[PDB]
RNA sequence: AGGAGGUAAAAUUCU
RNA sequence: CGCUUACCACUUUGUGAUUCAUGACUGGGGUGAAGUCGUAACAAGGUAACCGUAGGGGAACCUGCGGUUGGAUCACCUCC
RNA sequence: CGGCCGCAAGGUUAAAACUCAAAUGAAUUGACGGGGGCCCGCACAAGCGGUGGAGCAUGUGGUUUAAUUCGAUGCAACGCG
């Protein structure tokens, strides 16, 4: 029923945000953020864990990461992650703590970057519609079977619409607090 | 065979490729560092190895080893770079020289200094 | 002895 | 001297040729990984293979036609 | 890619980067064949009695467990040390 649906909607669209703002913190920025460095995975006596449960992420700085991480013995083997998590970022070791450099920001990265982050915006963008159009697809279904009023059918239809603004308009901030810190 | 033949088209020698356009057959030139990934070789081996790509004095983008134990080189660090190639990384036709502007020498090394800019240590 | 005729249905893979 | 004619450098307009660069995107390709689908080739590789050509088919490939050997097989029955 | 040829299908001419430490030929010893020949063994046939079903003894995988000690795992481990 159309009450059901509008409920599905909302869900599977912010799931779309969220994914979004997710892929988002992981991304090379102007400024340092623990957020990524967080994901990275590090091999911890056999059983992989993310680097976020062996060691704690300061802010050293705008641009330099410090990693103090709890356990001394795994130091060398948690500083090998973050140059095998590929990301272009060299590690280095000075005393119980490691410095982790922030680059400077070049010409030919922020483009490359802001491309990809306004490309990554617009495969959301398409997330959130795609949602559109099974929602759509449910009630449009429904007219049919006839369930629903002609007048039903219009008045929901334009709650999705609602809807995919809304989740869009929230994708569009997103993208912008980043495009703050690319410029 | 026939001289005959030979006359009218004279033996030509093949033209040798270089293995490495360092530019005008440069001993070795000037980059600085674009990327500074690190990969895995090819069949046979397994490791880590730690590389970088170099934007260079004459514009080329290849790509560069980093050799020896621990290098400080990151993003915008400017290198000098070498001839040799690294046969177990693919496209890496090129070495960092240690020492070498923003290259530093290796820490502690003792044997082979020269490679990889190293000092006498003060004895 | 030479000649003839006749006589297996299909059934994959393994760093 | 000035003037004026010839030749004529630069500069301009039109339309082509060529060549260097570079371009969203993209067929095909090599490499790597040793993942997915089957099992095409190597033994007669289980319908011998392959060359040319033509059609078809997720894929190796299948089928037609001619060619080539760079082809394995000659034992038992029945009769003669 | 360019040229030239063809109505077309296409042909002809004919590279380069990139990439590999091979690619290849013939002969050799094996192994192997849904190759051939000759020939063996309770291999088949021909027979007699069984297992596979049942209850139980016993071993093993498994499962469980505080522990179910370790080992043995196609034939050639499983009433095996
Ligand atoms: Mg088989
Ligand atoms: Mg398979
Ligand atoms: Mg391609
Ligand atoms: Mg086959
Ligand atoms: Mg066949
Ligand atoms: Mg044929
Ligand atoms: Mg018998
Ligand atoms: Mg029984």
Known sequence: ?183 | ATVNQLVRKPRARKVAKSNVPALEACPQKRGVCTRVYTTTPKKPNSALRKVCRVRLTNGFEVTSYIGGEGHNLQEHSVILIRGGRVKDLPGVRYHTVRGALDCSGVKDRKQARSKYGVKRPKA
């Open chain 1, 1 to 183: 029923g159309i009450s059901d649906i509008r409920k599905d909607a909302e869900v599977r669209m912010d799931k779309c945000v969220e994914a979004f703002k997710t892929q988002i913190s992981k991304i090379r920025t102007g400024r340092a953020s623990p957020s990524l460095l967080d994901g990275i995975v590090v091999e911890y006596y056999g059983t992989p864990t993310p680097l976020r449960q062996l060691a704690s992420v300061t802010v050293e700085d705008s641009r330099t990461l410090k990693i103090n991480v709890f356990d001394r013995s795994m130091s060398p083997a948690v500083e090998k992650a973050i140059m095998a998590s590929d990301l272009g970022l060299n590690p280095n070791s000075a005393g119980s703590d490691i410095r982790v450099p922030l680059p400077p920001l070049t010409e030919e990265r922020r483009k490359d970057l802001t491309k990809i982050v306004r490309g990554e915006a617009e495969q959301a963008r398409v997330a959130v519609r795609n949602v559109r159009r099974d929602a759509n697809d449910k009630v449009k279904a429904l007219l049919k079977d006839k369930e629903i009023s002609e007048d039903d059918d219009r008045r929901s239809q334009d709650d999705v619409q609602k809807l995919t603004d809304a989740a869009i308009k929230k994708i569009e901030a997103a993208l912008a607090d980043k495009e703050a810190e690319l410029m």
